[PDB]
Structures are given as C-alpha cells and as structure tokens.
Design a protein around this nucleic acid. Structure first.
Ligand SMILES: [K+]
Ligand SMILES: [Mg+2]
Ligand SMILES: [Mg+2]
Ligand SMILES: [Mg+2]
Ligand SMILES: [Mg+2]
Ligand SMILES: [Mg+2]
Ligand SMILES: [Mg+2]
Ligand SMILES: [Mg+2]
Ligand SMILES: [Mg+2]
Ligand SMILES: [Mg+2]
Ligand SMILES: [Mg+2]
Ligand SMILES: [Mg+2]
Ligand SMILES: [Mg+2]
Ligand SMILES: [Mg+2]
Lengths: 158, 353, 52, 98, 191
RNA sequence: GAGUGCGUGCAAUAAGUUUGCUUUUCUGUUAUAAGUAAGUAGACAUAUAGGUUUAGAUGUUAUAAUAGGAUCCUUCGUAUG
RNA sequence: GUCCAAAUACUUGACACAUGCUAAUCGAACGUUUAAUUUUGGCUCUUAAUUAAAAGUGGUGUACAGGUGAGUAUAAUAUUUUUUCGCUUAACUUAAAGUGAAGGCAAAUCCUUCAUAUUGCAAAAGGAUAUCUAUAUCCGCUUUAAGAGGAUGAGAAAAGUUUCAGAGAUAGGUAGUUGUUAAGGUCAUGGCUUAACAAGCCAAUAAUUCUCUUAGUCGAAGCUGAAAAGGCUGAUCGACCACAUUGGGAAUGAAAAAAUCC
C-alpha cells in the first residue's frame, strides 16, 4: 500500500557488440543497429546508435555480442540493461560472473526502495516525538504557574 | 476636525498641575502620527531627540516632544483625574472635563466604570448640569457614554432635583422634561452609548435602559408636575395635551413594572450580586436617593389619573408606591444619621425642609 | 443542498432561483455525459466493425 | 470563464453568427474551444408558402451545450434566450402580464 | 396594443415626468400635447418632432417602458402629494413591551400620523428611520423633528452619466500640469 | 582623410542587485526581569462616597538568545571616457 | 470612364506630430470637505444631524481588446502516439462549516494584530432591505472538499517525428561534467542534491564556439503549375513570436500575459 513497486514490464531485445569496457564500473558501450528513412530521397540509411548499457556483475568484455533491453533506468545517461551474452569474447561465458535475471535486478529495487521508506517513517515519528516532548514541556512550566496562581485566588474565596 | 485640547482657566494652582501633566504626556502625543509617536517612547532615539526634538504645527507655534520614559515619566491617569476633579470649585474649572475626557478618549484610556457616575455627581451639585448634558450630547468627541446603569440613574436624579428645587416651576419643568426625553431618545437611537458592559446589565435587568421602570418613572414625575398646575387658549392646549401623555406613560409603566414589586425586586435576583452592575442600590444611603422621586412620582401620578376617572390605573400605581414606600421606609431605619440619602428623602418625601 | 434534501421550501426569492439553476445544471450534465458517451460507443463500434 | 456566446460573421448588412464555447476575455472572433452551432437573425420564409409566416434557422448541438452548461459555463443574454426556447434553461426575462 | 399607464399623484403631467428624469429632456415638454401622446408616439415619430440626439430619444423610451411596469424611481409610490411637494412622517408602534417599530409613512401635511387610518397611511420605499426622530433617504429635507418633505427636483430620477475629472486615466497628468502653469504666470504678473 | 544604430577590453556608473568579520531598525515566538505607565485580576474600607493595597495568570514594558523582513556599506552594473 | 453591391486600401521613413478622442466603474465599502434645510447650546459664534453636489481613499478592471513587424537565424528540458502521473490559495459552477475581539489614518470591505478552526502550525468584513400589536432574508468575506479550465512539473517510460536561411573560419567540448557505492529528495524517474572513490561522457566527416549578410515564423492563407516531401509570397483571415522613443531593470499577482511602474 505504502510501497511503490517497479513496473516490471518487458521491452524489446536488441543485439549489439560491446565497444568498450573496463573504463567505468558496471557500464559498457554497446553498438546496436538501426535504419533512418530519408523522406527527400525515399531511401533508408543505416543509423547505428551507441548506448551505455548497465552491467551489474561486470561480466562483459569489449568485443562480445550481447542482447540488451531498454526501459531499465539506472542512471542519467543509462537506460539499457544486459539480457544475456550471445557470443563471448576472449573467455567462455562459464568463466565470467553470472548475469542476474531482470527479476533479480527488479527485486533489488523493490527491496532497496522499501527499506528506504522504513527509514522515513521511523525518522519522521522520532522527529514528531522529539518535538512533541519539547512542546509538552512548555505546558508544564506554563501550567504550574497558572495552577499555582489560580489556586491562590480560589483559596481566598472560601 | 476638532480643535486641540487646551486648558486656559484654572482657579487653584493644584488643578493646573494635574491637567498640564496629562496634557503634555497623555493627550498631546496622540496628535502625532503613528511613526513619530513610537520614537518618544524609545531609548534608542533618546540621543537623537535631545538634538532635534519632534515638533508639531499647533496653533502656529511649533510644539516640542522629547524622550519620555514610558515606565517612570508617564503619570498615573486615574490619580491625576481624581486630583483634578476634586480641585474644581468654579464654572471655568468644570469646563475642562469636555477637553479632559476628550483626550482620554483619544488616548484609549479605559477609565473606571464608576467614573461617569462620579463626574455627574460633583458637577451637578454645583450648578453645572448643562456642561454635563453638553458632553452627553457631544458623545462623538467627549466619549461620555451612558454605559453604566448608575450614570443614567444619577443624571436623571439631578434633572428632577433641579426642577424640584424651585417647586416645579413651569418655565424650568418644561425645559427639564425636554432633557429627560433627550436622554431616553439617545439611549435608544444613538449607538455611541451601546457597549459590551451595557449589553450585560440589560440582560440581567431584562429591560433596556430606555424601557426601564426606574428611568421611565422620571419622565412620569415631571409630566405629573405639569398637569397638577393646570387641569389663554395657547396654554390650555398644552395642559390638555399633557393629560394624554400622562395616561399614556402611566399605562406603559404599569405594564413593565410587575405587580407588588419594589426597587430591589424589580430586576432579577442575579443582578444585585455583582458589584460592577446594579449593586449601589443595596446600600440604604443610595436606595433612598433614587427611591424618593420615583416614589413621589407614583403618588402624584396616581392622584391625577384618579381625577380623570381611571380606576384600574389608580389601584395599579398605588400598588407600586405602597411597595416602594414600604421598602423605602425600611432603608430609612438603617441609614446612618447625616448621610445624603437620609437628607434627600427626608426633604423630598418627608417635606421637612 | 442540505436544506433541499430535507424537503424544505426556498428561503427567499433568490434561494428559489439558485435551486432551479442548480437543477438545470445538474440535469444538463447528466444528459450531456450520457449523451456524449453514446456518441463515443457508437463511434468506436463503427471503427472496429469496419476495421474488422 | 467559459462562455457560450455568438461570434459575428458574414458581410456588411448580412449578419451571420456562430455559437461557440470560448473564454470570456478573448477576441470575439478568435478561434474558440468548440463550435456548438450557428444562428441567423434575419427570419426566412418557406419556399412554397403564402400564409406569411416566418421562421429562423438555428443549428445547435444540444448534447454538447448541456455538458458545458453543467460544468459552469455562462451563456450570454442572447444565447440564454435561445437555450430557454429549447427548454434547457428558464427565461431570464419575461413580458409583464399586468 | 400600446397600453398607457394612469398618471400617478407624484407624476401628474408630462412636464413633471420629463423634469424628474433630467438629462435636459424638459426642452421637448411642448412637443407632447398631452399625457397620452408620450406613451403613444413611436421612435420614428419622436425623431420627426425633434427629440435628439438619439441618446435622449433612446433614454426617454427607456423611462417610458419603465413607467408602464410600475418601476418608478424615488417617491413614486406616494399618494398624498400637493403641488409637487410631499410630506413624510414617522409612525411608531409597539412590536413588544421593549421594542418599537418606526416606519416612514406618507400622510397629509396637516393631519397627524395617528389620526390617519390604516389604509390611508402609505409606507414609502427607500426611506427608513435612523434613530428615533430622523428620516433618512434620498432627497428628504427635514422640516421638523420626525417630519421631512420631498420636492420635485430636476434629475430626481435620472441616471447620471459618468464624467472625467481632467481627461480620465490616460490624459490626466497633462491637463493638471498646464493648468498649474497658467496660475503661476498670473500670480507672477499680478505681483 | 571622414564617419559609424556593430563586437570587445579597461575605467566609471543611475535604477536594480549576489553575499555578509557592513551599519541601523522592526517583527516573531523562547527564557527571564519589573508591576513606578498602561492595563488585567483580586483582597479591604469609605458614602453628595467610589479610597487604600497586593498580585502576574492573558496582556504591556525591558534584557538575552534565536528566526525572519526592511535600511546603510559592499559586489555586479546603462550613460559616459 | 455611366450606375450599383460586396471585399480590399502607407507594401516606402519602427520618420516627426497641432487638435478631439480609444478605460473606466461601484454611494448597497468609506468617510472628507462646500451649499442650503432642520435641530442644540450660549448671546454673528458654537453642537448634533439630514440632503445635494465637487474632489478623494478603497474593490475589480486597465494581464482583455486594438496596433506594428524594428529586432530576431532555429534540434529544443521542442513535439505527436500509447501507458502512468503531478501541481493549481484569484475568477466560473456544486455543497459544507465559520463569519467573533482590538488597534492605526478623517473613516472604511483600507493597513497591523489577536481569539477560534481533527492532534499543531494555518483564516475572515462588513454593508444593505423587510416583517411584528427581536426575528428572518439579501450582496459579500474566510476556510475546506470536488467539477471545469489552465499560460501547469524539467513530469516520466517506450517507439517516432522536426526540408536547422546564405557565406566563411574554427577540433575539441564537457567539470556535477560521466559512472559506481551510500544517503537524502520526489507520486515516480533523473548529480535533481550531498559525501567519498573512479577518469570518465559527447565528438572526430564541425560536437563546440565565432564573424558577416538577410529575414517576423507558419497554414490548399494568397498566387501559380498537369505534376513533384511542387514553386513563390508571408497583405486582408486564423495560430505563434517580438516590440510600444532608444537602452538598462524590479515589484505586485493564482498567472507578466501591461500602451503600467523605476
Ligand atoms: K509600415
Ligand atoms: Mg545498407
Ligand atoms: Mg570595470
Ligand atoms: Mg564600481
Ligand atoms: Mg500601576
Ligand atoms: Mg569595505
Ligand atoms: Mg559602456
Ligand atoms: Mg494585451
Ligand atoms: Mg504579419
Ligand atoms: Mg464580525
Ligand atoms: Mg512501437
Ligand atoms: Mg546537471
Ligand atoms: Mg526586419
Ligand atoms: Mg520583424
């Protein structure tokens, strides 16, 4: 009810080639294919694009064919995630750390986000109790004077 | 709009001392704008004011305003008014109350609720009734509202006494009856005399001031003193006309005034408890003061109304008089010898003189 | 209005006018929404029918 | 403030109006949000009719005008008079009977 | 079709009507030979007589249609009028043993309020009692304590047309400045 | 040689303006102090009277802390050279 | 060169302008003054009012309408399609609750502040008209919950779209800039923000930056061709942008969207 769950929606799968790796942690540059239509010449032109794909366990080396998927937002300039390795490069797939399934990556977000809300509801309550105590403490010093001053008058009417 | 308050007539030197103190520290500063008025009462601007004190174009001559310690330099307004009030034994002296109460009204000084009744007593016993009615008429400036129930009972008392002093002469009685109606019309119509305190006193008495039997009885007194003289065509028309008002008012007072109920029982029993409203009546010295004219009115009123052939009213009015006279006689046996109440009642009802 | 759901008469001349105008806007919105809803349904059916 | 008003069109001495739903503080003939209908003030006469009667042609989308009236649209004095005849609103003015 | 309303005591004739509505319409008081000609003539007929500009003709037709509907101006519901002068008086009552209801009624100048019957005293609309013996209301000059009169004045019922102080909101600073310049020059010349 | 509604650097600069080891001041609570001014609460007494007296619970005044908004200086800054 | 109707009419010097006019309105917000009228008081002066005019304080509107094309060279936090959304104290519809107490100016529905409004922070304004032998209405004000509208948040995700004036030179640009871990923030996403590490990200054929010249942009809007993602224009019509002598600026307000203001 109070926890927001990720979309967990599947998108298209693209086949590309890892152009760079080992430069930044958990990130690789993959080159995918495309085709842009020119309306003036009535001709299709190859429009390849290079994105920053999210590599969770750093299991990709520059030169291997991989399958990526969009819609997995991880950073400002990253919106793709690795699905699996088509053809490895250098070493077999069995000699690299496994690629987590999208379920494992999505569950990490839900768990990580859910725990974040747990801290807010806790810090919020502490801030309210830490403030209500200081507010009720003023009533003590304010009510003791009134009761001490209001009882002085009542006692003088008996 | 109005001219600045000023005092230029003082017989005794003590009187001037009390007025000049308030005028230069409680009334004159009010004529300054809200900006400058906050500088006089500031310690941060004390050094500056000493060099270039504030000035105002009053009557051409530039006034002056230096630093004034709000806690020490400021005078006691109640005491100063009392001192100034007691030091008033001349016509020109009492003429300063119009300016004094005006400045106090500008300074938003909440004066004692009983102050209005005190000014009316001392000022009227010296022959300055007009100076009072002038303030009551000029309430938009002097702030002399008829808030207290006593102030209305104290003022109407003197109005009747001034006429009674000269054996109810027609020239003055005609003028005295105008002043009474001038008040009853002001309490109802004029809204300056309506305040929170008056709303509480009216709720306890269940009668508005303009319909209170204690006050209406004053209008019935002077009226009964007009038909008694005559009852020359121009003058004969007024006499015959006054006979209609008598039966009109006499028939209105009997309706409001319950049956066999004296002065201390007219209002609810919860009004005589609080001292801030309707408690002076308890003291016999004050009861006989306001129970003399109201009593003599019913007697003289029941008489005339009886000659015209009004049986019911004759028995009705005599019922109240008998109830007030009995209660009045009781208070006459407890008042201390020498008090004002014992003297007034002894001279009005007793007729010793 | 609470004064209308209790079956009370209008307070003054203006109260009656507001009661009538409010109803005119109440009935107009019902006939407008339902009327415009049938247009869409009748329009979507035609497209799907012809597109099929 | 949504208003149902008439946008005047036509030529000189030939007025033709356009019932529209536009914002109050906008040009009279600016492109509105919608066009509910049209209005011709000059009354016409049936072609093969010699009785002498006259009528006025008015195209109006009642279903669309009702919704806008139900959400707070304020029709002008003239459009209000037309909607009264249709029966959507009550007459704002009436001929004194006395 | 063109119904004509009966003349009321406050507006007996045409010269009185055209005077109340002001706007300098009392010029054409002679064009209308009778009271029945005012409410009968049409727009085109009033244009031939000389009722102009169009603002005056359209304004007169408005107060004309406003008179048929009994939508009189101020002091139109009066009944006891004498030579264009009415008299208001206060009628006191007893709504309760502690209250008093005062109503500004219209009765003859000589007769007294209480002497008049219930049906003869008429409460004029737009006039109330502020206090106990004061009559408040437009064009109510005081005659005595609790008595006021209504004199038929020009523009009594007119709808005042707006005016510009010194050229309105746009051309205001320009007007004042020039006027000031002329005054200073004259004072310098005088000295 | 003459001119220049252009770009730009430096100096200068009105309105306006970042910042605060700038200078004044107002407001807000918080904690105190006073009760001589204003008040607001009582306690006694007097009588053509309405006086004496204590009190801070709202509130007024003062100090301190603290938050915020206005002013002065500062920085930037048209014209101008 | 006879007549009538409709529609167009400074395309150039955004050159300078005599005169009259284009934004005012509410007295049922408010008192101030001057006139008579009627009341006081004291013997013309001096109170308290009523009435009518004449200048003002306030509220709303001048943020709409209308005019012009000087400047302006564009890919942008621009734009459609589907999924998911967020904000909105003025005005417009529907309803509920509350509309009390002081001070400042001559007075106020103007300023300042208080009490009350789930728990705690947080509001308001009064004016006017009837009835009877005080009560009940009317027009407003404050708050809250919705509809509508909106010029709204950088909304976001996926897949697309955008003929970017002409000529010349320029190979680096980017520093929260790119990513990781942790935390905060957000309906949500995003260095959006912060701390500590890593040296990355974009581009190489001009990304980026610069000078010159020219121009308001667009539409079957006008003209034209048989036709082309046709060509040209960018008057009248509609949408958008900019400006109001030139240059430099801020505040008010729900929102600058002014022929305002400095
Ligand atoms: K031009
Ligand atoms: Mg190919
Ligand atoms: Mg420099
Ligand atoms: Mg400098
Ligand atoms: Mg003291
Ligand atoms: Mg320095
Ligand atoms: Mg320069
Ligand atoms: Mg505009
Ligand atoms: Mg154009
Ligand atoms: Mg109130
Ligand atoms: Mg798709
Ligand atoms: Mg950034
Ligand atoms: Mg140009
Ligand atoms: Mg241009």
């Amino acid at each position: 009810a109070a926890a927001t769950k990720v979309s967990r929606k599947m998108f298209r799968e693209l086949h590309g080639v890892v152009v760079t790796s080992g430069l930044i942690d958990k990130t690789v540059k993959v080159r995918v294919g495309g085709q842009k239509f020119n309306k003036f010449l009535q001709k299709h032109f190859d429009d390849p694009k290079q994105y920053l794909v999210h590599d969770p366990n750093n299991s990709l080396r520059a030169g291997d064919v991989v399958a990526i998927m969009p819609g997995f937002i991880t950073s400002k300039s990253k919106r793709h995630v690795v699905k699996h390795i088509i053809a490895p490069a250098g070493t077999p797939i069995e000699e690299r750390p496994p690629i987590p399934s999208l379920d494992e990556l999505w569950d990490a977000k839900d768990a990580a986000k859910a725990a974040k809300k747990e801290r807010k509801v806790l810090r919020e309550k502490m801030q309210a109790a830490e403030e209500a105590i200081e507010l009720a403490e003023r009533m003590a010093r304010h009510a003791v004077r009134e009761i001490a001053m209001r009882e002085k008058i009542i006692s003088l009417q008996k | 709009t109005y001219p600045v308050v000023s005092f230029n007539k003082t017989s005794s030197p003590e009187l001037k001392e009390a007025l000049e103190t308030l005028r230069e520290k409680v009334i004159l500063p009010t004529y300054l704008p809200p900006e400058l008025r906050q500088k006089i009462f500031n310690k941060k601007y004390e050094k500056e004011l000493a060099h270039d004190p504030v000035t105002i174009q009053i009557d051409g001559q530039p006034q002056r305003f230096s630093y004034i310690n709000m806690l020490t330099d400021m005078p006691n307004t109640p005491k100063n008014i009392r001192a100034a009030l007691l030091s008033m034994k001349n016509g020109g002296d009492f003429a300063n109350l119009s300016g004094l109460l005006e400045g106090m009204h500008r300074a938003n000084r909440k004066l004692p609720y009983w102050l209005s009744a005190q000014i009316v007593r001392k000022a009227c016993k010296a022959g300055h009734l007009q100076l009072i009615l002038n303030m009551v008429r000029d309430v938009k400036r002097t702030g002399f509202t008829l808030e207290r129930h006593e102030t209305v009972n104290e003022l109407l008392f003197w109005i009747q006494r001034f006429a009674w002093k000269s054996d109810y002469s027609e020239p003055e009685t005609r003028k005295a009856l105008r002043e009474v109606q001038e008040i009853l019309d002001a309490l109802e119509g004029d809204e300056r005399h309506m305040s929170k305190d008056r709303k509480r006193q009216q709720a306890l008495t269940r009668f508005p001031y303009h319909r209170d039997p204690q006050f209406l009885a004053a209008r019935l007194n002077l009226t009964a003193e007009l038909a008694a003289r005559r009852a020359t065509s121009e003058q004969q028309l007024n006499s015959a006309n006054d006979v209609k008002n008598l039966v009109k008012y006499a028939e209105q007072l009997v309706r409001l005034w319950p049956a066999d109920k004296a002065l201390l029982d007219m209002y609810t029993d919860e009004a005589y408890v609080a001292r801030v409203d309707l408690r002076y009546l308890i003291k016999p010295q004050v009861h006989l003061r306001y129970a003399s004219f109201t009593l003599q009115a019913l007697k003289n009123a029941a008489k005339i109304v009886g000659q015209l052939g009004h049986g019911p009213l004759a028995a009705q009015l005599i019922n109240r008089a008998a109830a007030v006279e009995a209660e009045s006689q009781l208070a006459y046996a407890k008042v201390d010898d020498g008090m004002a109440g014992q003297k007034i009642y002894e001279m009005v009802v007793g007729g010793k003189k | 209005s609470a004064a209308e759901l209790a079956g009370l008469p209008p307070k003054s001349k203006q109260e009656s006018w507001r009661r009538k105008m409010a109803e005119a806007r109440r009935q107009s919105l019902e006939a407008g929404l339902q009327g415009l809803w049938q247009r869409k349904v009748k329009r979507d059916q035609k497209q799907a029918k012809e597109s099929k | 403030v949504l208003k149902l008003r008439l946008a005047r069109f036509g030529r000189t001495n030939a007025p033709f109006y356009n019932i529209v739903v536009a914002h109050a503080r906008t040009a009279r003939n600016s492109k509105p949000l919608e066009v509910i209908g049209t209005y011709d003030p000059v009354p016409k006469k049936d072609t093969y009719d010699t009785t002498g009667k006259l009528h006025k042609d008015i195209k109006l989308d009642v279903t669309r005008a009702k919704y806008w009236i139900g959400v707070g649209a304020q029709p002008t004095d003239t459009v209000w008079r037309l909607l009264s005849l249709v029966g959507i609103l009550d007459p704002k003015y009436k001929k004194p009977q006395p | 079709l063109p119904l004509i309303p009966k003349p009321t005591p406050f507006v007996p004739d045409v010269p009185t009507f055209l005077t109340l509505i002001g706007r300098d319409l009392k010029q054409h008081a002679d064009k209308f030979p009778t009271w029945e000609a005012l409410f009968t003539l049409t727009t085109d007929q009033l244009r031939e007589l000389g009722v102009e500009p169009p603002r005056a003709r359209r304004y007169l037709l408005r107060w004309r249609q406003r008179f048929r509907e009994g939508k009189f101006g101020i002091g139109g519901d009066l009944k006891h009028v004498e030579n264009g002068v009415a008299y208001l008086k206060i009628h006191e009552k007893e709504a309760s043993p502690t209250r008093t209801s005062r109503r500004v009624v219209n009765v003859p100048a000589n007769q007294h309020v209480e002497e008049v019957s219930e049906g003869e005293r008429v409460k004029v609309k737009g006039y109330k009692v502020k206090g106990v013996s004061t009559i408040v209301g437009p064009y109510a000059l005081p005659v005595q304590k609790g008595v006021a009169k209504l004199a038929v004045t020009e523009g009594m019922w007119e709808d005042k047309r707006g005016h510009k102080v010194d050229g309105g909101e746009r051309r205001r600073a320009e007007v004042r400045f020039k006027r000031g310049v002329a005054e200073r020059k004259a004072l310098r010349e005088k000295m």
